[PDB]
Amino acid sequence: YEHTAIIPNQVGFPYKAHVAREGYSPLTLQMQVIETSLEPTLNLEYITCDYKTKVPSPYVKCCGTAECRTQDKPEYKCAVFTGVYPFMWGGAYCFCDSENTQMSEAYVERADVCKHDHAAAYRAHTASLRAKIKVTYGTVNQTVEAYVNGDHAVTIAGTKFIFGPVSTPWTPFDTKILVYKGELYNQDFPRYGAGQPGRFGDIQSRTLDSRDLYANTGLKLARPAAGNIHVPYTQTPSGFKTWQKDRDSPLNAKAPFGCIIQTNPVRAMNCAVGNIPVSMDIADSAFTRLTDAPVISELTCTVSTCTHSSDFGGIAVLSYKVEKSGRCDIHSHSNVAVLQEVSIETEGRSVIHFSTASASPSFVVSVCSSRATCTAKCEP
């Protein structure tokens, strides 16, 4: 028919489904999730690169004011530091008393390690879960890995999974994510080209192969030291040297909701949040028919032992006399219980790990189209 339910979407947990239609046997589905991560769509506006000062050879005018036309550099500061007294090693840059000077020009330019490593300030759009649920649909065993936001009709082997539309706002989405070498950071990116000098992210990186560079990390020229050719430039301190080196606790750590973030694309695999809303369009024309199933009778379950919080939990010895052989459904109608499997063998005393986290267990077990109510007390 349509097994419309919610798997408990904290992956690793068994997810039973004792769905039974007329004409068939009891139908048993067993799901287990893995990796339905968010993947918010980024919009990168940043470079995260190191600054560079194109400080060329200063035009000596000896004597004479050398003109300083505007360069094409992103910080193209030239200053006609006049009154330069050039006394150097190997041949007279000054031969007069005054009017000799150095026009000094430097230009802000990008780093060459941007191709080595960038820094990405992506503004995040929405994201959507994508999951691999191992589904045991009777004798079918297959792990369906599809976009789990509800739109993608997951073609099962004779089934139609619809995992989603899940309500998850608990995500690693911030307003702006800085990604740096795999290091995540939900960190406040500035305006595109408005940084403070030495602010975190000083280089304007509109494109990763871009053409401009906003930068408030300005050089500061001066009338330099006499004799030695020192056109000193009081530049900014490197914010990319700071915002990575001596960067904060990275947003890859500190996963709220207990998720596992990872960024080839920035997505949070294993994110233990919520239940997966799943609609199984699966008919009774894949399951075993009711006319050929073993007619179980005399259903009496036992309480062999009770664990308080163990995985297996309970010793459940279910006595049952069967009309014929067959597979036995376990799909008990108890939220306080968890069936150890949906497997059940040819009849007799079927032992079963009656998993139950409740201390006062009373599980209404469904066995072969019959039911019982096992009772017990767990352990500490």
From Swiss-Prot:
Glycans are attached at residues 141, 270. N-glycosylated. Residues 1-380 are extracellular. Disulfide bonds join 49-114, 62-94, 63-96, 68-78, 259-271, 301-374, 306-378, 328-368. Residues 84-101 are annotated as: E1 fusion peptide loop. It is found in: Virion membrane; Host cell membrane. It is a single-pass type I membrane protein. Class II viral fusion protein. Fusion activity is inactive as long as E1 is bound to E2 in mature virion. After virus attachment to target cell via host MXRA8 and endocytosis, acidification of the endosome induce dissociation of E1/E2 heterodimer and concomitant trimerization of the E1 subunits. This E1 trimer is fusion active, and promotes release of viral nucleocapsid in cytoplasm after endosome and viral membrane fusion. Efficient fusion requires the presence of cholesterol and sphingolipid in the target membrane. The precursor of protein E3/E2 and E1 form a heterodimer shortly after synthesis. Processing of the precursor of protein E3/E2 into E2 and E3 results in a heterodimer of the spike glycoproteins E2 and E1. Spike at virion surface are constituted of a trimer of E2-E1 heterodimers. After target cell attachment and endocytosis, E1 change conformation to form homotrimers. Interacts with 6K protein. This is Spike glycoprotein E1. It comes from Mayaro virus (strain Brazil).
